[PDB]
A paper describes a structure:
[name] and PPP2 fit in none of these categories as both enzymes neither display cofactors bound to their active sites nor require the styrene motif or ATP hydrolysis. Instead, they act on the carboxyl-group directly attached to the aromatic ring. The trimers of [name] and PPP2 in the crystal structures represent the functional biological unit, evidenced by the size exclusion chromatography data and the extensive intermonomer buried surfaces and interactions.
Apo-[name] crystallized with nine molecules in the AU, in the space group R3, forming a trimer of trimers. [name] crystal structures were solved by molecular replacement, using the PPP2 4NC complex structure as a search probe. They were refined to 1.9 and 1.5 Å resolution for the apo-enzyme and 4NC/Co2+ complex structures, respectively. Surprisingly, the active site in the apo-structure has the same geometry as the 4NC complex structures. Here, however, several ordered water molecules occupy the space of 4NC. In all crystal structures, the center of the [name] trimer contains a potassium ion. All structures contain a central metal-binding site, formed by three equivalent glutamate residues (E88), one from each monomer, which coordinate the metal with side chain and carbonyl oxygen interactions in a distorted octahedron.
Author numbering:
A (entry chain B): 6 to 230
B (entry chain A): 1 to 231
C (entry chain D): 6 to 231
């Protein structure tokens, strides 16, 4: 049982419901605003000093992230996020919340003229707090990478099959944590360095992640670097 | 009674309404999403808070269960290699404030990861999770019953396809083995049987007669009646 | 930056949050009710005079959209939607809202005895307003089509790859805007005319669409009949 301490997460008073609604909206802002490059909308999700971790970015502040994202546009980074289940753990005494947003990362790549997707199921974790004005903001963001897969875009062909089986060979896959191996191979081939100390549902960092989430709910200071 | 022409001709509170109705629909919607967020993550305390103490659940591989028996057989399934996840993909609520009854309609994809002869693959099943909700003595929304419409089914390659893997998977997903099961969850049932689970072949789809049975119970629930999904 | 002017979209007053919740529910009604043929539930999403656009129907009234959707059932149209991220831009001064609902359109097809899905990721845009009873209603609906893919249903086979390559040729795909090419091909083969003038994330109509969205938020009249 990774979450034995229960906070406000179902039912509750109207204020608690509304706070959980507002934090869920904040989290979904990643799927809605980042995919569409609605950058003012996106930046409103975060504290001014917020820190983000991604596969290809590693660690970033929020405008570090915004502009390395905008530069992802021209050298062919095409990433989308299907939101598929969002709920919130809320501590009204500390005004702290954890947003748990399940997503599929779907990234569209091209290898030797063949288009394909990599699809990675995961949990985005948003560490949120009310700022001095009563507005929820995300101070930290990190991802549990759960499972991933290769996805053809066109009808398969034996030609394309054997060209792609070369890049997604085992030897290239195992050098990355089980959970985001296909994503890592594909993004490496695009030329990004991979942050390989990212949490999955198989490795050490799982527990590190949940520990941070628990300390966050209790009102404590954390550091996700 | 239910037709495919219009299965839901009587409208309840499902959009707009009073602030109190909106909040009740929000709370029921959250409860439903608890399945995808909490069950996948084995957050069992959070999960159990979704249900009445006596709640009844149906799945393909478990058949009928209580919430307690379902929790137990679930936690044991992850050592038997069961790796099921749920993508939530559209949840709304029908609310009857006169009976304080609600129906949560939660679209999902069941996505289960399997292995066959060293070949990993997913089965993805699009469906409607139906939560039959009521308010308990503390005024909290709780799911008394849960059951699924299994709509459509597909095999999903995890790695790049290979001819070797193509025809070694063809042996398992033969029409012979597929058509033992209702259209809607055939691939899912073949794969879970290969895992050794007994399949409940009596579950609603969008093509069998249990479709009507399901909608009929949903209607009776909205009207405040007692139902029994063991049938 | 496509959305430079900010309206109510996060936090705000309790009334603003509740209005954004009501608009989000309205948008999700497309995936929950249309898929399940809950037509009376679906109809309550729209103003009486609402207009809708899809690839396979083009411009429709809500009443005519419902009728041709019913007619699609025995023409073999089996369309579903996976909702995958919905937020709302709200202007409380005009009581106007834009519902942005990400989805995957997932449509089941058959070609030469082989079944398959087309999956198309997109943004459903609901142009909503509070009506004179204070109910949120959509007056306009149109879609940004972002990207699509072929999806095998069964275990792949050399024969079925062979057969399907005939339908999803590059010559057949190139007739349609990048964003919904596989979807347009498969729906054309179902017998429908395709509306080739829908917004994508690659064509000029993208800007036309966002222009209308901004004018809608300001309380102005728009017309999406292009
Ligand atoms: K969703």
């Amino acid at each position: 049982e990774p979450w034995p301490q229960l906070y406000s997460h179902l039912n509750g008073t109207n204020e608690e419901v509304l706070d959980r609604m507002k934090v869920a909206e904040l989290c979904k802002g990643w799927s809605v605003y980042r995919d569409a490059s609605e950058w003012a909308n996106f930046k409103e999700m975060f504290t001014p000093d917020a820190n983000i971790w991604t596969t290809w970015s590693g660690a970033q502040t929020i405008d570090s992230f915004i502009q390395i994202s905008k530069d992802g546009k021209d050298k062919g980074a095409f990433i989308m996020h299907r939101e598929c289940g969002t709920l919130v753990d809320l501590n009204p005494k500390t005004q702290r919340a954890i947003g748990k947003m399940k997503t599929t990362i779907t990234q569209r790549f091209e290898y030797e003229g063949v288009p394909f997707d990599i699809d990675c199921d995961n949990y985005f974790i948003f560490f949120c707090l009310k700022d001095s004005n009563g507005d929820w903001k995300a101070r930290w963001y990190k991802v549990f990478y759960v499972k991933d897969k290769f996805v053809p875009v066109g009808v398969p062909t034996a030609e394309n099959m054997e060209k792609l089986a070369k890049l997604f060979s085992k030897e290239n896959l195992e050098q990355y944590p089980w959970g985001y191996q296909y994503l890592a191979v594909a993004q490496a081939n695009l030329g990004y360095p991979i942050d390989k100390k990212l949490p999955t549902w198989k490795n050490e960092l799982y527990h590190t992640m949940y520990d941070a989430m628990k300390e966050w709910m209790e009102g404590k200071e954390i550091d996700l670097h």
